[PDB]
Design an enzyme around this catalytic site. Structure first.
Site, PDB file in Angstrom:
ATOM      1  N   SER A 228       0.764  -1.241   0.000  1.00 59.28           N
ATOM      2  CA  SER A 228       0.000   0.000   0.000  1.00 59.28           C
ATOM      3  C   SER A 228       0.804   1.306   0.000  1.00 59.28           C
ATOM      4  O   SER A 228       0.208   2.381   0.042  1.00 59.28           O
ATOM      5  CB  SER A 228      -1.012   0.000   1.161  1.00 59.28           C
ATOM      6  OG  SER A 228      -0.385  -0.187   2.416  1.00 59.28           O
TER       7      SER A 228
ATOM      8  N   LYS B 199       0.126   3.916  -2.760  1.00 62.30           N
ATOM      9  CA  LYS B 199      -0.856   4.990  -2.663  1.00 62.30           C
ATOM     10  C   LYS B 199      -0.245   6.391  -2.666  1.00 62.30           C
ATOM     11  O   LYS B 199      -0.950   7.370  -2.904  1.00 62.30           O
ATOM     12  CB  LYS B 199      -1.728   4.777  -1.414  1.00 62.30           C
ATOM     13  CG  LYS B 199      -2.672   3.585  -1.572  1.00 62.30           C
ATOM     14  CD  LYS B 199      -3.360   3.168  -0.283  1.00 62.30           C
ATOM     15  CE  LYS B 199      -4.285   1.997  -0.561  1.00 62.30           C
ATOM     16  NZ  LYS B 199      -4.811   1.357   0.667  1.00 62.30           N
TER      17      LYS B 199
ATOM     18  N   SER C 100      -5.510   4.635   5.036  1.00 61.55           N
ATOM     19  CA  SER C 100      -5.103   3.853   3.871  1.00 61.55           C
ATOM     20  C   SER C 100      -6.347   3.255   3.238  1.00 61.55           C
ATOM     21  O   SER C 100      -6.548   2.042   3.257  1.00 61.55           O
ATOM     22  CB  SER C 100      -4.132   2.735   4.259  1.00 61.55           C
ATOM     23  OG  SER C 100      -3.442   2.263   3.111  1.00 61.55           O
TER      24      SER C 100
ATOM     25  N   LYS D 122       3.805   8.110   5.054  1.00 57.95           N
ATOM     26  CA  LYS D 122       2.839   7.046   4.779  1.00 57.95           C
ATOM     27  C   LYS D 122       3.371   5.651   5.097  1.00 57.95           C
ATOM     28  O   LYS D 122       4.487   5.308   4.725  1.00 57.95           O
ATOM     29  CB  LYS D 122       2.405   7.090   3.306  1.00 57.95           C
ATOM     30  CG  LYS D 122       0.899   6.920   3.088  1.00 57.95           C
ATOM     31  CD  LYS D 122       0.582   5.591   2.444  1.00 57.95           C
ATOM     32  CE  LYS D 122      -0.892   5.273   2.538  1.00 57.95           C
ATOM     33  NZ  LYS D 122      -1.114   3.944   3.176  1.00 57.95           N
TER      34      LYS D 122
END
EC number: 3.4.16.4
Length: 262
Positions: free
Chosen positions: A35, A38, A96, A213
Site C-alpha cells: 500500500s 498509494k 489507507s 505514509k
C-alpha cells in the site's frame, strides 16, 4: 555517530533539501511495495490539470465490493454518498483507504468505462515514474494489491515522496493525525463519518515528524516512508519489509536520528 542496524531488508534516507544521501541498505534492490503505492496515486491526482479539490464524487457500489473481495484496508465510504476530492485524499492517506484509491483512479483516468479509466490511470502512474527518471519502479495497480509487477526500491520511493512533498496540499494531508469527514448523503443530508486516524505513529512519537505514509502487504511486509524536520533540516527516507508495526517505527526512528547527527 555509528551506522544503525535495522530489521528492514531495504532502507534509504537523504537530505530532502539538497538530495545528499545519508543512509543506505540495499537502496536499489527491487521489492514489493504494497500500500505504499498509494503515495503515487495521490501524486498523480494532485498533478492533474483538471484538478478541483471541491469536486464531488459519488461512491459507487464497485468501490465498496472491491475492498470486501480483496479484504483491503478502507475508509468506510458509504455507497450513494457524495465525497469531495479533498476528503478522498484524506481517506486515502490516513487510514489507507483502498476504496478511496479506486474512487480517485476512476475519476482521473481517461476513458468511457470504469475499467478503461483505471487502466489509463495506472498508465499515468508509470509515466510519472519515468518522468522522474526512475528505473526500478513499476506499477500494476492503483493501490498496491495488483501483482508481482508492482515493485520499487527504497531510493526510488523516497524520490517519489520528495517530489510529492513539493505540493502544499500533500504536505498538509500527510502531517494530519486525525480527520473527520462530513459527507453528503443520498437524500441530501449531511453525514458525520467516524473519524479517520493516521496509521503513521511517528507523527506522535517522533518530534519534528511530518510524513509520510505506512505500507504493508502479503509480499511487501511492513513498510514506511518517513520525513521529519529539525533545525531547518529535513531528512526523508524509506524502509521496506520490516518485520512488524513497532519494528518498522523504530527502524525509521533510528535512521532519522542518525541522519540528523551526521
Amino acid at each position: 555517530v555509528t551506522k544503525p542496524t535495522i530489521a528492514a531488508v531495504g532502507g534509504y534516507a537523504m537530505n530532502n533539501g539538497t538530495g545528499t544521501t545519508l543512509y543506505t541498505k540495499a537502496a536499489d534492490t527491487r521489492r514489493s511495495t504494497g500500500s505504499t503505492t498509494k503515495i503515487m496515486t495521490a501524486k498523480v491526482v494532485l498533478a492533474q490539470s483538471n484538478l478541483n479539490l471541491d469536486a464531488k464524487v459519488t461512491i459507487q457500489k464497485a468501490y465498496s465490493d472491491y475492498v470486501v473481495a480483496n479484504n483491503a484496508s478502507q475508509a468506510h465510504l458509504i455507497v450513494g454518498d457524495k465525497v469531495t476530492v479533498r476528503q478522498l485524499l484524506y481517506g486515502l492517506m490516513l487510514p489507507s483507504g483502498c476504496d478511496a484509491a479506486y474512487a480517485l483512479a476512476d475519476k482521473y483516468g481517461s476513458g468511457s468505462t470504469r475499467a478503461a479509466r483505471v487502466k489509463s490511470f495506472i498508465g499515468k502512474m508509470n509515466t510519472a515514474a519515468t518522468n522522474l527518471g526512475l528505473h526500478n519502479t513499476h506499477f500494476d495497480s492503483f493501490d498496491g494489491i495488483g501483482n508481482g509487477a508492482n515493485y520499487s526500491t527504497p531510493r526510488d520511493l523516497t524520490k517519489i515522496a520528495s517530489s510529492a512533498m513539493k505540493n502544499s496540499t500533500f504536505r498538509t494531508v500527510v502531517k494530519t493525525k486525525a480527520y473527520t469527514a462530513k459527507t453528503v448523503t443520498k437524500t441530501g443530508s449531511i453525514r458525520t463519518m467516524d473519524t479517520w486516524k493516521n496509521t503513521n505513529g511517528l507523527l506522535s512519537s517522533y518530534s519534528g515528524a511530518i510524513g509520510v505514509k505506512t505500507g504493508s502487504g502479503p509480499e511487501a511486509k511492513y513498510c514506511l516512508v518517513f520525513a521529519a524536520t529539525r533545525g531547518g533540516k529535513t531528512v526523508i527516507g524509506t524502509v521496506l519489509a520490516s518485520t512488524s508495526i513497532p519494528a518498522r517505527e523504530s527502524d525509521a526512528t533510528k535512521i532519522m536520528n542518525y541522519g540528523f547527527a551526521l
